[PDB]
Amino acid sequence: KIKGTVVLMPKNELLNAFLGRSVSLQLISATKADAHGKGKVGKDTFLEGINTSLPTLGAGESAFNIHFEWDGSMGIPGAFYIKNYMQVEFFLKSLTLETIRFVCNSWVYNTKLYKSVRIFFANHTYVPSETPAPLVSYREEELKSLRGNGTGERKEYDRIYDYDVYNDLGNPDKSEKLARPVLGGSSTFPYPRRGRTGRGPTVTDPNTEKQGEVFYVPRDENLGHLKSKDALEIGTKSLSQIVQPAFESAFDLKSTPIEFHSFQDVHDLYEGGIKLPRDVISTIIPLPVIKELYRTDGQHILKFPQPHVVQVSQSAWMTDEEFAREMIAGVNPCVIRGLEEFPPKSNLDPAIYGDQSSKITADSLDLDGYTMDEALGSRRLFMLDYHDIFMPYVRQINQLNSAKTYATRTILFLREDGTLKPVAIELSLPHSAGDLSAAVSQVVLPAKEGVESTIWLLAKAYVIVNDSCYHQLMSHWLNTHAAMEPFVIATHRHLSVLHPIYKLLTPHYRNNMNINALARQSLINANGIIETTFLPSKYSVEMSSAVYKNWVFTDQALPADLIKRGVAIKDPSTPHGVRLLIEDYPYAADGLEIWAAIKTWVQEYVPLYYARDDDVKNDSELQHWWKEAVEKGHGDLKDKPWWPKLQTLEDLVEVCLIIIWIASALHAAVNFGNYPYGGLIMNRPTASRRLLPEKGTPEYEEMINNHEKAYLRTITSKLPTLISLSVIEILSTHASDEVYLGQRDNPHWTSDSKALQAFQKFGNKLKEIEEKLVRRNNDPSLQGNRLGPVQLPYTLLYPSSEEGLTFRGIPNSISI
Numbered sequence: 044k045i046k047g048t049v050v051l052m053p054k055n056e057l058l059n060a061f062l063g064r065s066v067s068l069q070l071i072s073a074t075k076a077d078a079h080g081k082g083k084v085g086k087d088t089f090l091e092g093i094n095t096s097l098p099t100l101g102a103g104e105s106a107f108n109i110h111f112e113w114d115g116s117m118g119i120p121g122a123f124y125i126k127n128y129m130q131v132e133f134f135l136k137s138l139t140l141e142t143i144r145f146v147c148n149s150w151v152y153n154t155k156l157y158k159s160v161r162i163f164f165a166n167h168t169y170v171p172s173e174t175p176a177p178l179v180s181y182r183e184e185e186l187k188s189l190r191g192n193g194t195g196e197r198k199e200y201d202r203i204y205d206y207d208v209y210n211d212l213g214n215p216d217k218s219e220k221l222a223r224p225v226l227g228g229s230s231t232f233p234y235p236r237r238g239r240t241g242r243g244p245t246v247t248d249p250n251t252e253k254q255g256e257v258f259y260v261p262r263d264e265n266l267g268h269l270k271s272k273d274a275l276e277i278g279t280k281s282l283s284q285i286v287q288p289a290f291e292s293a294f295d296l297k298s299t300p301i302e303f304h305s306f307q308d309v310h311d312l313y314e315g316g317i318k319l320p321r322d323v324i325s326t327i328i329p330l331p332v333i334k335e336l337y338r339t340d341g342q343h344i345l346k347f348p349q350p351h352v353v354q355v356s357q358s359a360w361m362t363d364e365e366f367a368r369e370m371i372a373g374v375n376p377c378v379i380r381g382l383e384e385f386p387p388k389s390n391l392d393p394a395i396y397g398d399q400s401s402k403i404t405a406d407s408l409d410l411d412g413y414t415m416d417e418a419l420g421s422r423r424l425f426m427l428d429y430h431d432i433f434m435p436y437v438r439q440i441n442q443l444n445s446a447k448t449y450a451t452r453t454i455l456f457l458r459e460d461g462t463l464k465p466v467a468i469e470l471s472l473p474h475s476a477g478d479l480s481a482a483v484s485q486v487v488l489p490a491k492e493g494v495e496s497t498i499w500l501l502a503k504a505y506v507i508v509n510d511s512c513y514h515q516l517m518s519h520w521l522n523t524h525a526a527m528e529p530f531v532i533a534t535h536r537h538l539s540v541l542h543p544i545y546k547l548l549t550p551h552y553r554n555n556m557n558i559n560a561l562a563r564q565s566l567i568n569a570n571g572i573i574e575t576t577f578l579p580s581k582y583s584v585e586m587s588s589a590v591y592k593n594w595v596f597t598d599q600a601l602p603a604d605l606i607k608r609g610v611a612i613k614d615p616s617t618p619h620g621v622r623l624l625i626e627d628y629p630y631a632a633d634g635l636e637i638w639a640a641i642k643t644w645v646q647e648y649v650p651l652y653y654a655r656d657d658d659v660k661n662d663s664e665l666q667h668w669w670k671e672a673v674e675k676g677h678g679d680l681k682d683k684p685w686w687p688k689l690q691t692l693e694d695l696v697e698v699c700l701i702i703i704w705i706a707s708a709l710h711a712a713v714n715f716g717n718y719p720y721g722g723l724i725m726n727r728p729t730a731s732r733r734l735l736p737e738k739g740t741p742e743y744e745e746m747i748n749n750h751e752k753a754y755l756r757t758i759t760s761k762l763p764t765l766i767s768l769s770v771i772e773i774l775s776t777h778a779s780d781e782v783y784l785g786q787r788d789n790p791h792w793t794s795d796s797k798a799l800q801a802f803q804k805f806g807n808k809l810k811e812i813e814e815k816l817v818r819r820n821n822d823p824s825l826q827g828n829r830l831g832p833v834q835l836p837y838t839l840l841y842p843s844s845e846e847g848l849t850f851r852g853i854p855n856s857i858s859i
């Protein structure tokens with residue numbers, strides 16, 4: 044008989060009841076097959092007893108002994124079936140035979156709920172052509188089980204992965220004001236697909252999916268946590284459904300001032316705190332995750348944590364130096380572009396928006412003594428250009444009550460000292476014969492004194508409102524969360540758990556479908572958190588669809604992105620093949636190090652399973668996986684010529700490298716600085732509510748006499764500020780059970796020592812890189828861009844981190 048050990052976690056975690064005839068397992072042979080070519084299956088074997096021997100276990104886990112009637116004639120077991128006869132589900136961790144290891148990490152529901160018996164494979168890795176013959180059909184049948192048939196309402200215990208469009212955000216049955224365009228499946232609104240839920244149509248609209256208390260994700264995608272405080276993804280739901288209403292009542296009852304009246308009222312939030320009604324505090328204080336967001340006296344006070352950006356200087360955010368520095372080392376460091384001609388041009392139709400010629404004059408700019416031609420030629424001119432991106436939406440946004448924006452463009456000059464300085468801001472508005480508004484476009488230049496300094500500060504706020512919107516919806520939501528989901532779905536639908544590429548990529552998908560489903564429900568839904576806290580309101584998500592029209596997979600590679608944006612040039616004589624035009628560009632310089640480490644890892648892994656390009660072309664699973672990811676997952680862009688073909692080792696490496704980059708380092712860089720930089724609403728306003736005032740009006744006089752109030756009346760109001768600070772605080776927090784780049788949730792994910800050795804080298808390289816990044820932050824010559832006047836060391840690309848709001852650490856995946 045074969046001695047075995049089963050490790051599982053009872054539901055209450057995320058014992059004698061498991062004995063008796065509660066759980067049975069059946070070994071399956073990988074070498075001996077029946078008359079049909081399928082591995083022979085053993086007898087039902089039940090758990091015999093609780094093993095309390097090994098000191099190693101922890102995590103609310105329990106081990107059970109079991110002995111299998113299996114002689115050499117049945118061959119070597121390569122898989123097993125398991126049936127749970129208990130009413131309640133349990134989390135199966137692993138099976139070990141004494142060595143043959145099985146890494147399961149899967150919920151096993153009552154046997155009657157399953158159409159086919161749950162099957163698990165040993166930790167060996169096989170491309171299809173290498174699958175032991177007795178396991179071939181089992182392998183394909185499990186993939187067919189995972190794909191489902193594209194119909195039906197998905198249930199909690201289902202493990203069916205499929206695609207659908209974003210037609211579940213509107214709530215037309217509640218109000219036609221909550222109706223939203225379907226995103227995806229049309230040329231008007233192209234969009235990445237998301238996980239199919241199948242709840243069916245709304246009563247009023249056959250094209251929109253009805254509401255649901257729970258937005259399904261394949262069962263094992265819904266991460267349980269040993270500590271409730273680690274279930275960060277449930278925070279947005281509680282925030283939108285419970286906390287927001289409580290905050291709103293405090294305002295409706297006039298228990299707290301409706302608006303901030305000075306910058307100190309904002310600073311007060313993380314100092315003495317804000318006093319709220321007792322019942323409001325009582326509503327918030329007992330909630331999991333939410334209670335970790337604020338310190339309280341348990342009675343009337345809520346205190347937010349001090350954001351990193353003000354920890355050394357609370358006023359530094361208002362410096363021109365910090366405004367420009369955050370474009371290369373801030374929460375959204377990947378939009379700035381080189382400017383090689385002047386004035387900047389627009390590709391928008393003047394027949395629609397009016398003359399689009401820039402009004403910025405070269406002679407008005409202070410380029411530290413450089414002429415415009417000199418600045419252009421020396422590659423010292425850059426820009427943060429939101430003119431063409433926002434112009435198409437300015438009219439409709441400005442028609443909203445309490446929303447007014449400009450399509451902005453900021454010109455930056457790279458000083459000889461290596462820091463960026465802002466030299467002009469153009470605030471553009473569309474013009475069309477017949478416009479009722481008399482407001483016009485204008486250029487604002489830097490100023491430190493007088494009303495001119497206030498107008499320049501407001502111009503920076505309009506720019507950052509554009510940036511915050513683009514950051515949240517595009518850099519963050521579209522480019523990481525939404526763009527990655529199709530790849531997660533395709534991977535489970537077409538790459539067997541035995542597949543080397545499945546093993547290479549899946550750690551980088553942890554919690555992504557889960558947070559996305561929770562986002563469709565409470566973050567990007569009609570009247571959800573984003574719509575109620577950011578400038579575009581009901582136009583927010585569709586704006587991301589317009590941007591997706593220009594999304595290019597291969598341009599997500601870091602070198603390609605830097606080159607496309609004109610912030611680096613190709614240069615083979617450099618370590619990374621590219622020369623940065625802003626040498627001390629923190630995000631890019633640190634990013635290239637991480638990018639290189641991932642590349643080395645993928646390049647070492649792939650060859651272990653694919654010897655030649657032909658081996659990649661002939662992998663049926665791999666080919667079906669890619670064809671589906673492109674043609675269905677990102678199907679609205681299937682007509683684009685830039686998609687890799689995946690017929691060579693090079694292409695496979697490229698595709699995997701880009702996927703891992705987006706899921707780990709790119710997402711970390713644009714996510715974990717959310718509260719550290721945006722926790723002070725003045726530094727990262729999410730909305731603007733009025734345009735610049737006309738001379739001779741009280742609003743203009745206010746800019747002169749009360750600049751802080753002029754600023755506060757312009758940016759996000761206090762109520763939505765409380766809600767948005769809470770959400771970005773959640774998003775910037777690392778759960779204590781996070782799995783970071785260079786780590787895996789199990790040391791036995793594969794039995795291949797070669798793959799394991801390569802992974803160990805990858806982790807060692809990341810530790811090596813962290814020491815280098817530490818040296819960069821400690822280098823006094825780099826203080827200007829790596830720390831700035833806010834004296835905040837750029838640690839967002841440090842690979843490792845402890846739990847919490849740390850401003851560092853690269854998780855493997857888009858996990859929050």
Ligand SMILES: [Fe+3]
Binds near residue numbers: 523524710714774859
């Ligand atoms: Fe995120």
